[PDB]
Design a protein around this ligand. Sequence first.
Ligand SMILES: [Zn+2]
Ligand SMILES: [Zn+2]
Ligand SMILES: [Zn+2]
Lengths: 152, 175, 157, 193, 41
Amino acid sequence: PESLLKLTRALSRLPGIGPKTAQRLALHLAFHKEEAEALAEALEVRACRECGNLAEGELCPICQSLLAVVESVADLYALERSGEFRGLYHVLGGALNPLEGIGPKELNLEGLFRRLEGVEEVVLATSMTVEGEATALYLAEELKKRGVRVTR
Amino acid sequence: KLTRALSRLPPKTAQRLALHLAFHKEEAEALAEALEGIKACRECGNLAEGELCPICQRSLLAVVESVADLYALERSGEFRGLYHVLGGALNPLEGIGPKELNLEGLFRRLEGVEEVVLATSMTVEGEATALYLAEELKKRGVRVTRPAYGLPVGGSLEYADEVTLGRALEGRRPV
Amino acid sequence: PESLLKLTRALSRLPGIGPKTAQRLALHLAFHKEEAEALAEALEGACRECGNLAEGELCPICQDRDRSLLAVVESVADLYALERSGEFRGLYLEGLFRRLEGVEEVVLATSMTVEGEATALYLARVTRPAYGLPVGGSLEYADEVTLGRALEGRRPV
Amino acid sequence: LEEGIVVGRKPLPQGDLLLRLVTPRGSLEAVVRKLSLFHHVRFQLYALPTLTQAELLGRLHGLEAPRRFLLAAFLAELAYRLASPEAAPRIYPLLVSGLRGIAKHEDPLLPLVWAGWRVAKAGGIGPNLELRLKRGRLGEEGVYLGREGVEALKATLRLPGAQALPHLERLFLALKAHAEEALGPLRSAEAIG
Amino acid sequence: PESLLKLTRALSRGPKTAQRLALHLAFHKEEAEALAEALEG
DNA sequence: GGCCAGAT
DNA sequence: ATCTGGCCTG
Ligand SMILES: [Zn+2]
Ligand SMILES: [Zn+2]
Ligand SMILES: [Zn+2]
């Protein structure tokens, strides 16, 4: 029906989905009616007070020396599944893309500026992508001129 | 609660999508709206706006285990009969028997002259259900037909099971 | 190193392995003579009337079997599979017409490949296995053409 | 690699299947990604353990009868509930023999009860036969087994099956009562009416 | 067959290619002999 | 099924 | 700025 049409539209709109997959999942949820309200209730943690990251509670586990910088939560999850580092970290709200028009003014970097205090070492956990590498190098140069140690 | 709901969907993509939904409230509200909007036909069992489907608003009838199977059959296009949707299959291990199925609802729609396709599962349990329903129908004076056992299209002999091949042999047809 | 050339050519000739895969296998076997010798010492460890390959002139099918039933098979892999099956007591195309003598029913054990379809059309008692749905699994994991043929091939019981 | 029987099929909502098997070394539970019921199968488990390979060793074609299928399911469930690892080497050949008997014999109930009584005896749940048996004990309460029934039960419990068959050529009710007393209710008990 | 399994196992030192090659060698005595000669070589 | 290299 | 064909994961 029209409700099925709008459900398929909603599923297709969200990233990482296929229209055939969207339709098959719509039919599957038409088959399972309890899973509908189960997902609805499971649909309904905020920014950390200090770091600003998503926190299961009041502080993110990072807060609860080292300082890594990333752009997506997937990097944080890869780090935690690796689980070799314990120091502080960060997540950035974008990547400086000349063709997109992202600029350093749109970054969240003054938090990093005040966070610079009491930092023994920093790791540039940037994405292998060339633009991300360039952005990380440019930030590391902007931070070296202050007189802070930067490590790869 | 989120991780389990995302895992119920048929890992990394589930998590990335959950995170995006957390960071995109509007999409989540739109999805809840579509779900409420979405919130079986009395006779056929397919989808319908309200009570009866547009088709309902018949000499052939197809017995089917679930609604998904009904819809698959309709997508096949080779069936324009009516359907009776059971609640499942017989299962002593799950306490499922004559006191759990919709037999009496079935008997309110059946007549003397009719053919009931036996589209049960291809298991020991589905075969037992098929034979039981066939016996119940022959007692109650109605034809019993069973889809053809045999090899599937695009199937190789090397990887076919011995039972499928034996049924193919036993059920071989002239040409 | 001229000796390895023949080995590389021999492994190259078999289907499914490219020249670089053969060279890689030869190099891996060059410094691993332990399992090369193990493979060498482990290596040791068709009749006209049938067409079956077997040690000796007469196959085990010829060597408790009947000549009434003869089934034509596309490949010997299917012959081995049906030997592992064991549902016919009988013995096991272009030459079918001049083998029709002494045969009272013809069994068609060929696969349903398009080549088999064309061969059957060209050759047009003779019997052929039916088209139907397999055993076990889930009805949602099937294909539309099989559904249609099973619906139209529906048998009376 | 292990060899055993298929006695449990629980479909999984994600399209998988929960398998329940018993070997001469003990019962087990296994799962498969995406082997028919009551088939003696040799399988390789990887670890619930996930099955990797399966080999068919035989089919019981005659089990498709409704009553025969119900009796076979009863026997398999009772075997699984009695499938202790110590008793498994005893029950497994008894399981196979009972399945073969119920497949081949004209009356499945005869070899069914014959195998079930021996499985109950070997599983540590041997009833105390020292005319009505109650909670595995003879007396004036319970199902009236009768003198002939008591004699046949004693012969089966003491003599081997070869000469125990003629004696048994109602005990099912007593065996069911004893099994329910020992282990509790049975899921499959609803089917028979 | 024992020699077939021995060959598939030596080739495994995927199983589908191992099998295809073992079958091919069984059905090509000359090629298999040449391969045993080159391996001895 | 979905993303990227290279020519117009 | 558009568009065809090859590639990896599934
Ligand atoms: Zn924090
Ligand atoms: Zn309708
Ligand atoms: Zn021969």
